[PDB]
Design an enzyme around this catalytic site. Sequence first.
Site, PDB file in Angstrom:
ATOM      1  N   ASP A  86       0.549  -1.285  -0.292  1.00 33.90           N
ATOM      2  CA  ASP A  86      -0.205  -0.273   0.155  1.00 33.90           C
ATOM      3  C   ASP A  86       0.755   0.861  -0.300  1.00 33.90           C
ATOM      4  O   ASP A  86       2.023   1.053   0.238  1.00 33.90           O
ATOM      5  CB  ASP A  86      -0.603   0.168   0.998  1.00 33.90           C
ATOM      6  CG  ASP A  86      -2.624   0.366   1.138  1.00 33.90           C
ATOM      7  OD1 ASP A  86      -2.215   1.453   0.242  1.00 33.90           O
ATOM      8  OD2 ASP A  86      -3.133   1.001   2.035  1.00 33.90           O
ATOM      9  N   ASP A 108      -6.337   7.010  -9.127  1.00 31.25           N
ATOM     10  CA  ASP A 108      -7.718   6.837  -9.466  1.00 31.25           C
ATOM     11  C   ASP A 108      -8.618   8.113  -8.175  1.00 31.25           C
ATOM     12  O   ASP A 108      -7.627   8.408  -8.018  1.00 31.25           O
ATOM     13  CB  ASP A 108      -7.851   5.900  -8.161  1.00 31.25           C
ATOM     14  CG  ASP A 108      -8.027   3.966  -8.820  1.00 31.25           C
ATOM     15  OD1 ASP A 108      -8.115   4.148  -9.936  1.00 31.25           O
ATOM     16  OD2 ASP A 108      -8.207   3.533  -7.856  1.00 31.25           O
ATOM     17  N   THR A 181       1.154   4.071 -20.882  1.00 34.01           N
ATOM     18  CA  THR A 181       0.164   2.977 -20.054  1.00 34.01           C
ATOM     19  C   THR A 181      -0.158   2.348 -20.991  1.00 34.01           C
ATOM     20  O   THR A 181      -0.335   2.324 -22.354  1.00 34.01           O
ATOM     21  CB  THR A 181      -0.195   3.530 -19.193  1.00 34.01           C
ATOM     22  OG1 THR A 181      -1.086   4.427 -19.406  1.00 34.01           O
ATOM     23  CG2 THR A 181       0.061   4.396 -18.072  1.00 34.01           C
ATOM     24  N   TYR A 183      -3.986   2.280 -20.519  1.00 34.74           N
ATOM     25  CA  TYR A 183      -5.289   2.888 -21.718  1.00 34.74           C
ATOM     26  C   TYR A 183      -5.242   4.026 -21.727  1.00 34.74           C
ATOM     27  O   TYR A 183      -5.630   4.230 -22.750  1.00 34.74           O
ATOM     28  CB  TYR A 183      -5.757   2.910 -19.960  1.00 34.74           C
ATOM     29  CG  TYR A 183      -6.754   3.794 -19.989  1.00 34.74           C
ATOM     30  CD1 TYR A 183      -7.942   4.217 -19.915  1.00 34.74           C
ATOM     31  CD2 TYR A 183      -6.204   5.425 -19.368  1.00 34.74           C
ATOM     32  CE1 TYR A 183      -8.997   4.585 -19.798  1.00 34.74           C
ATOM     33  CE2 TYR A 183      -7.411   6.509 -19.088  1.00 34.74           C
ATOM     34  CZ  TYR A 183      -8.939   5.946 -19.343  1.00 34.74           C
ATOM     35  OH  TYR A 183      -9.979   6.894 -19.767  1.00 34.74           O
TER      36      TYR A 183
END
Lengths: 203, 205
Positions: A86, A108, A181, A183
Amino acid sequence: DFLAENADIAISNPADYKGKWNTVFGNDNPIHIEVGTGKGQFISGMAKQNPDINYIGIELFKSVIVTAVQKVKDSEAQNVKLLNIDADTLTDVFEPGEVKRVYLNFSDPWPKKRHEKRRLTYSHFLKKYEEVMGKGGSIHFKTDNRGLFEYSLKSFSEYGLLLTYVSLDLHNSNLEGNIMTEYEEKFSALGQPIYRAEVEWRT
Amino acid sequence: WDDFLAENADIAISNPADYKGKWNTVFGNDNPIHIEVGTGKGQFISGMAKQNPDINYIGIELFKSVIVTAVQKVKDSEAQNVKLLNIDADTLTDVFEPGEVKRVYLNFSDPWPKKRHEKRRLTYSHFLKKYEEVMGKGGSIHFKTDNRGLFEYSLKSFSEYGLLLTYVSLDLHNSNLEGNIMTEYEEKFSALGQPIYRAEVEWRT
Ligand SMILES: [K+]
Ligand SMILES: [K+]
Ligand SMILES: [K+]
């Protein structure tokens, strides 16, 4: 597990190497990290372009970091390690000043006000980045999300960071040698704009 | 014409330096004074004056040929909270005392793309200093432009100066901003496709 057979790329015990990451790579090259690696096209591509820079990519999900290790297993690149941690545990893995740069790609957005705290550009995370970089590092951020970028610029400013680079349409600007990336290389080249910023600490 | 401006000297103040530190006596009230650098034809300033009667507006514009049109808009639309000055940004320090201005408006300012002309951009450090000399540390700069290159430079220039970015829109016409007064040039960007960028920047107090 597939991660156990490739334990030379995917490190399961990163906390043990705090302050000693130069012993893992075997050199004193600058360490650049990425939060939210995903399938790893970005990190692997950056590795091949810059062999003299050490890269560490972090990803929360095991199911997707598996594809990231495969991309580092495809290309012989020995300058990339992947961690299943994390963003809050970066301070348990790195000593202040051990990291020289943090990459945030299409992070995000979390548009709802109650989830501002989850954005990788919020003050809490900017503090975690400072705690691993000291005052000598930088944050390179790129996204196609207008709302997140707008928030991020304000968040960087509130924290007291210096904006040294900003592009409001990356694709028809200077493509110095930026790696895309999954995306980014998928959607439009002449459609929706990609925003980019480089921020650093003031001295 | 020069005859028109002399005839309408109540709007187009010919001697602005004489009122330095006394601008509240010109308007007859103590309401905040907001300025616009590069007023042009004056649609923005007249619209803002109409929308905000409790705020005093002063527009500066060097081009005498276009300030004549700005004066006509104030002459017709009887607003008493707008004065126009035929001066440059460098003369702001001769016209206002520190703290007399509360806001600086910059709309679609000359981009000056070339590196050798960086110092001419209204968002360059020299002009940011001129704005600080008339506002002190209690004011802000509200900037709007369609020019990607100028906005990008401005953001970095505002950051380098140590200013705080409080608002930023990378597509103004598709944003929350209600009460947005458009310039003559802005009215064509509604359905052309190209985005208008906006920033609000202030001093750290
Ligand atoms: K990511
Ligand atoms: K800033
Ligand atoms: K203007």
